[PDB]
Design an enzyme around this catalytic site. Structure first.
Site, PDB file in Angstrom:
ATOM      1  N   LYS A  27       0.839  -1.022   0.080  1.00 40.35           N
ATOM      2  CA  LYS A  27      -0.202  -0.051  -0.029  1.00 40.35           C
ATOM      3  C   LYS A  27       1.080   1.212  -0.003  1.00 40.35           C
ATOM      4  O   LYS A  27       1.864   1.289   0.828  1.00 40.35           O
ATOM      5  CB  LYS A  27      -1.079  -0.035   1.214  1.00 40.35           C
ATOM      6  CG  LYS A  27      -2.235   0.271   0.989  1.00 40.35           C
ATOM      7  CD  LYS A  27      -2.170   1.901   0.849  1.00 40.35           C
ATOM      8  CE  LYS A  27      -2.155   2.806   2.296  1.00 40.35           C
ATOM      9  NZ  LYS A  27      -2.038   4.214   1.754  1.00 40.35           N
TER      10      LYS A  27
ATOM     11  N   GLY B 163       5.810   4.761   9.219  1.00 37.30           N
ATOM     12  CA  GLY B 163       4.692   6.009   9.238  1.00 37.30           C
ATOM     13  C   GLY B 163       4.832   6.456  11.072  1.00 37.30           C
ATOM     14  O   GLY B 163       5.797   6.093  11.532  1.00 37.30           O
ATOM     15  N   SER B 164       3.763   7.051  11.401  1.00 36.70           N
ATOM     16  CA  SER B 164       3.474   7.739  12.751  1.00 36.70           C
ATOM     17  C   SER B 164       3.733   6.728  13.516  1.00 36.70           C
ATOM     18  O   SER B 164       3.199   5.666  13.492  1.00 36.70           O
ATOM     19  CB  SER B 164       2.515   8.715  12.589  1.00 36.70           C
ATOM     20  OG  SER B 164       1.189   8.116  12.999  1.00 36.70           O
ATOM     21  N   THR B 165       4.210   6.860  14.837  1.00 36.47           N
ATOM     22  CA  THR B 165       4.097   6.279  16.057  1.00 36.47           C
ATOM     23  C   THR B 165       2.624   5.974  16.317  1.00 36.47           C
ATOM     24  O   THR B 165       2.161   4.856  16.800  1.00 36.47           O
ATOM     25  CB  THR B 165       4.725   6.923  17.273  1.00 36.47           C
ATOM     26  OG1 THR B 165       6.281   6.637  16.718  1.00 36.47           O
ATOM     27  CG2 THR B 165       4.698   6.226  18.735  1.00 36.47           C
ATOM     28  N   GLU B 166       1.822   7.051  16.212  1.00 32.62           N
ATOM     29  CA  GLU B 166       0.306   6.899  16.383  1.00 32.62           C
ATOM     30  C   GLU B 166      -0.210   5.592  15.557  1.00 32.62           C
ATOM     31  O   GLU B 166      -0.952   4.728  16.117  1.00 32.62           O
ATOM     32  CB  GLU B 166      -0.390   7.824  16.115  1.00 32.62           C
ATOM     33  CG  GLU B 166      -1.990   8.080  16.225  1.00 32.62           C
ATOM     34  CD  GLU B 166      -2.741   9.293  15.536  1.00 32.62           C
ATOM     35  OE1 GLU B 166      -3.797   9.551  15.786  1.00 32.62           O
ATOM     36  OE2 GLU B 166      -1.747  10.003  15.113  1.00 32.62           O
ATOM     37  N   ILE B 167      -0.052   5.460  14.119  1.00 34.34           N
ATOM     38  CA  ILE B 167      -0.562   4.587  13.254  1.00 34.34           C
ATOM     39  C   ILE B 167      -0.130   3.349  13.461  1.00 34.34           C
ATOM     40  O   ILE B 167      -0.602   2.013  13.654  1.00 34.34           O
ATOM     41  CB  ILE B 167      -0.531   5.119  11.944  1.00 34.34           C
ATOM     42  CG1 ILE B 167      -1.492   6.145  11.744  1.00 34.34           C
ATOM     43  CG2 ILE B 167      -1.109   4.010  11.001  1.00 34.34           C
ATOM     44  CD1 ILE B 167      -2.759   5.856  11.820  1.00 34.34           C
TER      45      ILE B 167
ATOM     46  N   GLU C 215       8.603   1.032  11.629  1.00 25.93           N
ATOM     47  CA  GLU C 215       9.682   2.076  11.581  1.00 25.93           C
ATOM     48  C   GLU C 215       8.883   3.349  11.546  1.00 25.93           C
ATOM     49  O   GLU C 215       8.086   3.693  11.052  1.00 25.93           O
ATOM     50  CB  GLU C 215      10.222   2.089  10.089  1.00 25.93           C
ATOM     51  CG  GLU C 215      11.333   0.930   9.837  1.00 25.93           C
ATOM     52  CD  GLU C 215      12.704   1.027  10.496  1.00 25.93           C
ATOM     53  OE1 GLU C 215      13.158   2.414  10.796  1.00 25.93           O
ATOM     54  OE2 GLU C 215      13.278   0.167  10.276  1.00 25.93           O
TER      55      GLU C 215
ATOM     56  N   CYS D  23      12.142  10.739   9.300  1.00 26.36           N
ATOM     57  CA  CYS D  23      12.031   9.927  10.656  1.00 26.36           C
ATOM     58  C   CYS D  23      13.099  10.428  11.516  1.00 26.36           C
ATOM     59  O   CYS D  23      12.801  10.571  12.774  1.00 26.36           O
ATOM     60  CB  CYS D  23      11.954   8.544  10.181  1.00 26.36           C
ATOM     61  SG  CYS D  23      13.466   8.000   8.938  1.00 26.36           S
TER      62      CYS D  23
ATOM     63  N   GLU E 165       7.578  15.457  17.122  1.00 23.74           N
ATOM     64  CA  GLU E 165       7.970  15.486  15.770  1.00 23.74           C
ATOM     65  C   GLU E 165       7.169  16.574  14.939  1.00 23.74           C
ATOM     66  O   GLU E 165       6.079  16.265  14.776  1.00 23.74           O
ATOM     67  CB  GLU E 165       7.897  14.175  15.126  1.00 23.74           C
ATOM     68  CG  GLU E 165       8.274  13.763  13.660  1.00 23.74           C
ATOM     69  CD  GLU E 165       8.382  12.513  13.329  1.00 23.74           C
ATOM     70  OE1 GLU E 165       7.219  11.904  13.263  1.00 23.74           O
ATOM     71  OE2 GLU E 165       9.474  11.799  13.155  1.00 23.74           O
TER      72      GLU E 165
END
Ligand code: NA
Ligand code: NA
Ligand code: NA
Lengths: 494, 494, 494, 494
Positions: B186, B239-243, B262, B296, B393
């Site tokens: 994706k 991607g983001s830490t949240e996702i 990552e 990142c 970030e």
């Protein structure tokens, strides 16, 4: 804590060890071993020769047959036996340290705290490798399954020197036994006793008969017989560069046995102007004088940057003059005798050579005592690269200090040697350290230290200083024979 | 030299790629991708959702069946196919560079000389691993032959971000294909186009259908479908830490697929007082501002020792003020626009918070152009650890400079973060460099450099910056499933 | 060769172990642990909950601080400590084997000769890894020196089951300690006692306080507290596939801690018509019935080729009918009770389901004694793939025999499972063995054997049987955090 | 598909290659190379001697100096250069295959489809290793950071034979160049031409001058000069056991250069009674006859179990009589001439010896043409272990069939040899295959196949067949010199 020594330890083992038993030489000959501190005979030792080596090789070959106890033994159990041997050496540590000092001359405190500690750590390290040196499964082209077995090389002849008698024995037995080989070991005629006592402990640990066999005797007889033997698969020799050549030629002229060699050096110790002066002086002292100077990797070309030369030399001369020479059983002694009369004379010859060729004698230069083989800690200054004392390994307490200007200059001078065993760099600067560790043509480069051996890190020579490596995972390579097995399969898939 | 760009490259691929063919979404929906320099739509792209992911997974699963062309292919041939892919990317290097710039915003000179070079190097590196990641033969106790097969983990879902679209695609495809996996990828809705062109090159290179399938679309739809899919064996998400949290929860709640992540960072860049000032200033600028700040591992906490703080800040501000922001196809442009409106607005929000919380705005702070998502290079001085701009970030051209006194202090402050992706140290001193590289809790520590990526060296997070490693040999670990085969034999011998 | 057991061993340790001291739970609550042979309470044990886990994690985190005794300890010395722990367990072997039998129910002869032996071998194996798991030096592009450090992951939460209490403790502690981690371990409420005695031995061996902490308690309280803890870096869980999901979700939902899982199975044991019949029958018996059937990897689908089906079944029933169920302290006993009343009822429920769904009950099928949780060895024949007893893990002495015709058929049926922990193949044919070992989707494939574990060879699941591997060198991977250090150098050379 | 050959290809390169330039010999002498299919001279080649070797060594040493283009080149770029060389060979594949056939005699179809394919695969395999042969970071005791660099051994002398001229060149150049070494190569006087053409391609590919130097000439002159050279660091020799001894002695007598040897064999091919008959017959034929019998590892003792002996022999003789001997450019030709008149006469000598010592001549036994060096496919039956033809390497189309009864007998008879290069076993039984592959003392054991070479799997001899391994990861070991760097650090932590 160092336990008080027995200054006259009893000798229990003084024969040839084959199949876990003690034998006289076929000829019944014995030779005396001497205490270098007194010049007196300790005892006589069986003088093994070709016929004794033949018996030992046959015993080792029998122990290596397919289906034998040693070949069927679980790899993990080889590890258990190495750990048991280390436990028995630890039980007998105070005795062994004293016997090492009696036969070799090094200070008892050092035998105890350094040599025996390193023996224990080497054996325990290799015990842990016994069941971890994996072969590979390999994704070869085609409809096949391909893999490697790491098998033992087989009957290993091992010839060890007199400078670190127990430690050299351990550096050889650890990897060879971890990987399931069998051994015929020739110990130095100057220092046979501690290795023979360790054979008693090999039996007591439970090793099957013939897995380790030890033949005391001389080089041109017993050593040569191992090197030229038609049924020895691999030889590992530690000693002079000159004899190393003899071993490699013997291998080629006999059965093409595999050969590794750990030989001499003239290792450079490079002191940059930004070094920590006090630490660099103390470590340069150690680098040279450790073990009565009888270290393959001694820092015997001390290169010092010109802006700090005079101060470094003043401090080095003071430290050499303060170094205590004496009875190695006295706790105050820093330096015992040289190992024997032959070495004593050779070192006196090299001191005279340095005087004759115009090196500046800054301290020492003479005999340090009446009895035994004691030499004064000797320092030469303004040494030049073309001097014999700057080129040839002296193997005694004789320090060479050279001056240099630039980092580029010192690389070329340090590397202009047919030796390449070790080197060191003293600097606070990151880039100088990385520049020099990369550029120096040496098997070990120490940065801000010297003579740091670890069972985990390999050691060995570039150039005429040797081939192959001992210690670490690398120390297993020479003791393994690789077999590829490649099997047709119905249909290979990833 | 950099070949001239086509500043308006035609788009050839804008659909879902399954079984080496191009598909509309089942729904027939499409979404726009925009050129961030102008705000204008480039083209429509198929909007994949769950039903499209399900088609792609089934194609991947079929391509992974035992006996398929991809499963039977020699490992060395997978390497040949990766090398052919790299050659096709190299053939089309200027096109892909220009497309990358058009869709993402980064300068064409950097797309060409950096991103595309790194892509080629990554694929060529992994091509070399295809037939070298061996299993083991293992000396287990008893009468057995035991070995491991390194098999592919299977159907691998790979979700990649928009900051380095081509490079992230290569970091994921290289190791997965080298180890014989199949992929459902994706790509980011902001930057789908270059990855889709590369799919065309995958077909051209001759990879079997179904080995790589690409589904453009949105995260809550297509990404979530991959993460929760019952027949996806492994997911890798950047991607983001949240996702990241969403991904790991979906794995646990579906089929216990294996997960690597990552994620983001707030990486500290520590400048000691003995650093080379010119180099440290330039590298700290690069460390923060590379790729429009969209990296990142950006060095977004620049810790500067108090004795050099004022000079470092002055030079850093001069360098930020000189940084050229502009059309990314102009050779003079150092900084293009941010990737999209959402990011543009978030960054302006962060700048506002920096001002509100009392950090010293030293330059920039606003929009850089009246069209396109361009933001001025912005530097805040006198940043304190509790400020939002020191903790979160920002992912834009916003630099934080913090003052410190001691080495012990700065370790604690650098490590007081729930992030741990990277860090760096600038110093001439050997001991300071070794002290800090050991003590910093980060996946990569750079010494006297920054953002030095090599395909040979692993990269990834400590703490909440991720888990697992990409690049190097390590990057193969998450793409391998290990099988032990243990076989009774008549009599085991060493 | 087994020392007579103390059939009523004294309990010395029944509290929470933190910082090498014994603690009541903060709540002062306790829970009973029961002797499954009698149904009677052995003793009470501290009931740890979140607040106790929090104390343990703080203690572990303190022990892990840079500069602490555990962080500074030589890697080789961690090995010495693991070897010392093994020696202490060996000293206390007869006691530990009896206590294991008392609390778990397994026969004392098996506790002594199998569980304790394996424990010793696991710890001694990992002792050897402590100073051998090297990082890499890496030939990255450019003027750089790049290397990796293998650092500890940090605070490791370890949740272990009741089926092999001491062995599972060892499988977790060995690799975690070898690599320098610290541990917070939650032991099973059914079998806490032996692990707590081992904690006393950990103290005795010299491990620094905080390096190993053990919290007994329940799953939803203590285990969940570990899985969700914000300062636990890594969790390893062994238990049901169901609870594995809960663990992975907790990791994603908290701090993105690293996760490995060893879960259930329904492992196929495939008997080809050319198998040695007597060996196959005995090994298939063992494969299923070992440890009261309470084995993750039990061979609970026994596929038998049609030509040998009737003979195999007749012989299998004869062996099940003569398997001795009884007091586990009696040397004649082959099978003790199930671990608790919950399991006892569950297994009897599965037997009921097997009969209802039309499998042929060939022997057993009911309770084996009037007290304690004893179940008759039970064999079902003519089992079909769609039956509940062919799909769900029973975890008791209930054997399923299924008939098949061809090797292609049996691969598909064996692999048609969401489990994939292990599998086995009995055949004399080289090609059938290689065909099936490659094709079977399982973490271990045994050939002509079953349940051959060695510390050297990795073990773990495909599919929903888990992720990651324990044992071998692989067992270190999940306990290591990789740091890349990349250093600018003046001029890189090969 | 096989392209039409030029049956009389032109020769473009026939001089000494040093510094990417072509040189006459210092003496201006040349020697003829002959087409063995006709006995006629193809062309003259420069006759290199000691002075020419000295020039080549100085060129190599210069290319190896620190700071040179080859030393500074990225490891990944060494890989790129190997891949470029492979692409150039592939461009020129039809030419090089025909030239190989012209100079060597092997059939063109085989040169094209086998030799050239394997050359490309070897070079491409090693290209992938260039940036992956990592050193280690090592957890040594004490406050130190210790690591190893894998450096190149340096100037490598490589002496290759005539049986597979291009493939042996690739086996040597791949690992040496992948690891950063420089080469002085001596090619066989019988087959110098293809290697010299490849030197042109080395230049074209962009390797720096001096990295590969090639000296055609004679063995006692050029070869000996390499082996004895004082500035050659490593020698690799493939050839007779007799000359291997010469090489090892030279190394010992000169500068202690590191040596690896690949020597002859008398490899056993064991056909058990349960083998697949048709496959075993075809593979035993290939095993012996491949490459005109000119293969180090030829299956020249075909041991056949007594129950299948008569049938296997009948079928083998029919296959040998069907084997088409003739012009190697004709597509129907299976066997070309032997390489030269010396070999032609030596093989006829062995045939006579076989007839005279009482082996049963079943077919062949003489010359196959009146021009060129063609020998009839010859099969001897009822061969006994003490016969010359059962002991000495014939290196021609002469097959020995020996009868045996038991598996223990055949193991012992196979292993009763001072050779141990390879062996094979044909059987359907798992346990027989594993018993034999373990027990046979040979560097490669093939099971149900023969002559399966993969660049991924190592190859080399036990006993007098050689030392060291080529191919695979193992092929890099002899080309690496290991340096330990051990750095004092403020405080070591895990
Ligand atoms: Na002596
Ligand atoms: Na876009
Ligand atoms: Na010729």
């Amino acid at each position: 804590a160092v336990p008080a020594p027995n200054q006259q330890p009893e000798v229990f083992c003084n024969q040839i060890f084959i199949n876990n038993e003690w034998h006289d030489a076929v000829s019944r000959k014995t030779f005396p071993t001497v205490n270098p501190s007194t010049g007196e005979v300790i005892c006589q030792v069986a003088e093994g020769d070709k016929e004794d080596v033949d018996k030992a090789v046959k015993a080792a070959r029998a122990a290596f047959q397919l289906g034998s106890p040693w070949r069927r033994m679980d790899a993990s159990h080889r590890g258990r036996l190495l750990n048991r041997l280390a436990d028995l050496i630890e039980r007998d540590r105070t005795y062994l340290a004293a016997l090492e000092t009696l036969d070799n001359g090094k200070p008892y405190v050092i035998s105890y705290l350094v040599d025996l500690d390193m023996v224990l750590k080497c054996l325990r390290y290799y015990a842990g490798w016994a069941d971890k040196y994996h072969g590979k499964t390999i994704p070869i082209d085609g409809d096949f399954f391909s893999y490697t077995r790491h098998e033992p090389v087989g009957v290993c002849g091992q010839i060890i020197p007199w400078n670190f008698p127990l430690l050299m024995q351990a550096w050889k037995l650890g990897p060879a036994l971890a990987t399931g080989n069998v051994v015929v070991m020739k110990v130095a005629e100057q220092t046979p006793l501690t290795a023979l006592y360790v054979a008693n402990l090999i039996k007591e640990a439970g090793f099957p008969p013939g897995v380790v066999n030890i033949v005391p005797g001389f080089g041109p007889t017993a050593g040569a017989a191992i090197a030229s033997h038609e049924d020895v698969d691999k030889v590992a020799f530690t000693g002079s560069t000159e004899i190393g050549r003899v071993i490699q030629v013997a291998a080629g002229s006999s059965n093409l046995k595999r050969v590794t060699l750990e030989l001499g050096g003239k290792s450079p110790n490079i002191i940059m102007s930004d070094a920590d002066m006090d630490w660099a002086v103390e470590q340069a002292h150690f680098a040279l004088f450790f073990n009565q100077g009888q270290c393959c990797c001694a820092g015997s070309r001390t290169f010092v940057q010109e802006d700090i030369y005079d101060e470094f030399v003043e401090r080095s001369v003071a430290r050499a003059k303060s170094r205590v020479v004496g009875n190695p059983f006295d706790s105050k002694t820093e330096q015992g005798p040289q190992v024997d009369e032959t070495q004593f004379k050779k070192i006196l010859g090299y001191i005279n050579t340095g005087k004759q060729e115009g090196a500046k004698l800054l301290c020492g230069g003479g005999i340090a005592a009446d009895r035994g083989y004691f030499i004064q800690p000797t320092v030469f200054g303004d040494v030049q690269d073309g001097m014999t004392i700057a080129k040839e390994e002296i193997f005694g307490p004789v320090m060479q200090i050279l001056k240099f200007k630039t980092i580029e200059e010192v690389v070329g001078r340090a590397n202009n040697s047919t030796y390449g065993l070790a080197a060191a760099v003293f600097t606070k600067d990151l880039d100088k350290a990385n520049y020099l560790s990369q550029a120096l043509q040496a098997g070990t480069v120490w940065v801000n230290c010297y003579d740091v051996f670890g069972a985990q890190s390999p050691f060995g020579g570039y150039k005429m200083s040797g081939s192959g490596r001992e210690l670490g995972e690398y120390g297993l390579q020479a003791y393994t024979e690789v077999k590829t097995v490649t099997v047709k399969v119905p249909q290979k898939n990833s």
